[model samples]
Target chain A: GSKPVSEKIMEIKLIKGPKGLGFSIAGGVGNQHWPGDNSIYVTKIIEGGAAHKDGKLQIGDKLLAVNNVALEEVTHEEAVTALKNTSDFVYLKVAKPTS
Target chain B: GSKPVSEKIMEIKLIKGPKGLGFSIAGGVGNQHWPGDNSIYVTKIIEGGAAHKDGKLQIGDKLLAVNNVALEEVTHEEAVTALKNTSDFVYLKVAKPTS
Candidate 1:
């Protein structure tokens, strides 16, 4: 699969700001890169957003779960919709590229 | 100025891949937010691409110069056209969003 294979996953917790998570993601079922696997990747870290303020996550990192729901094998749009809401701090699990 | 404020500016370099730079930028003259600033922001980072591989640049990082040309006050399309080409390792100057 195109997703991370047998690696360490790090949990990143983010507190929402006025703009919510303040990041954009790439990859999913119809991602531009790789087929067979549907992994969610952080494409852009928006400034002044929660993710950017956290300063732990990078652009190419993979997302494992948002809250209790897993992000594995989801479509791009679903991921976006799922993350659109911002109330409080969001709990996120991510996997960094093992390079 | 609309560009980096009275803060430190850092240089980030990227090596192209089979798909070129593999990144996208938002915010030029017609950027969605902040009309006063023409600063270029890294919007997307493509997986397996040069920017993704480099992993030094974040999504909200300000692009100062691409190679020898400056992206300070250019339009969004101009920045895209400017960075579309990659011969040797492309030199980039960026300012990370200061927390």
Candidate 2:
């Protein structure tokens, strides 16, 4: 059942800046709006400012790992805990969106 | 053509907080980015921290409404503008990710 349905959706993506202080970023979820679904939205970047000079982040890079923690390795709850620990200039592993 | 093949390519998500300083937050696309597609990235919750005591949000929560605007209601281009209108303590209506 899972396999059959899973084929319908698109790939999962993750993006991040090299350091902090990056700004003016944007990305998309590929798919359009569906009922009862909530995912594709990049509302704000409070801490890192794009700063124009390009601090260390880009808009479309998928966030792969934080502090070496794979997003999947950590549960949704665990991710919350893992991310809060970073002090300054956090490391964000990112991959470019192919599409 | 858009009927049976109209399967999902992606779903949208959103996140927000009560006031500034609510630092911290966390998306996923269904597909695995096999050939061509780029979307599914949430890098930093630079601001509006989740705050241990809890000021605005919780984990596993998808962002929906920001500044009294329906996320889907606004085009991706216009969203940035709609969000900037708020003063402090932003509101976020979120949904869950169904595998």
Candidate 3:
């Protein structure tokens, strides 16, 4: 049998505020992210929100990039600001937890 | 606004193994679930699959029931058997990791 691998790439779009995206982010504090990692984690998704409706993003998924901006070494506030500043569409590069 | 809570209940259906649900479980012998807890954690979910498309279940979510059978105090083998033994619809009670 093949060895089990545990990572995958995912893409999502965010359009607006906390209500619009329907999800909350976590990281830059606590144990949400690994030390020295630049990614943020999807801490929660509203029951019937946009991100939930999108049907792709999941809790524990790591958000690596916001639009064209790579989130490497960025703080939690900086990541949130980048997402908030998105125009018609907010591009997200994410890493899904796989097995 | 309210104080942040980190727990929510969710329900899902698993039709069949490895492929139908498109997800994998981890617990029992690992640090996936807290010691003495009777739930199993969703370690990974396949992209574009049943569990992923379900739009509610997420990584880090804990499963508490299978087809009306509470999984409290069950070992990993018991949990897997209960799911496999499920016919028609595999009802699941899950807990989402929240912030």
- RMSD (Å) per prediction: 16.5, 20.9, 16.8
DockQ of 3: 0.02
Model 2 ranges with Cα > 4 A deviation: A1-99, B1-42, B47-61
State the displacement of the C-alpha of residue A32, model 1, in Å, after optimal TM-score superposition. 4.6
| lDDT at B16, model 3 | 51
User: Would candidate 1 be rated incorrect, acceptable, medium or high by CAPRI criteria?
Assistant: incorrect
Residue A55 Cα positional deviation in candidate 3, in Å, after optimal superposition = 1.5
Retained true contacts (fraction), each candidate = 0.00, 0.09, 0.00
TM-score of each: 0.45, 0.26, 0.42
Error of 1 at A99 (Å): 2.0
Model 3 fnat?
0.00
Tens digit per residue, CA lDDT, model 2, A1-35:
00111222222222334543333222223332234
Which residue runs does candidate 3 get wrong by more than 4 Å? A1-6, A14-18, A29-38, B1-99
Give iRMSD, candidate 3.
Answer: 13.4
Best by the DockQ measure: 2
Tens-digit lDDT track of model 1 for B25-86? 88888874366888898888888887787777778877877888789888888888788754
Best by lDDT: 1
lDDT of each residue in A1-99, candidate 1, tens digit only: 011123346677777867778888888888744666689988899888778877887888888778776788888887877787535867787765444
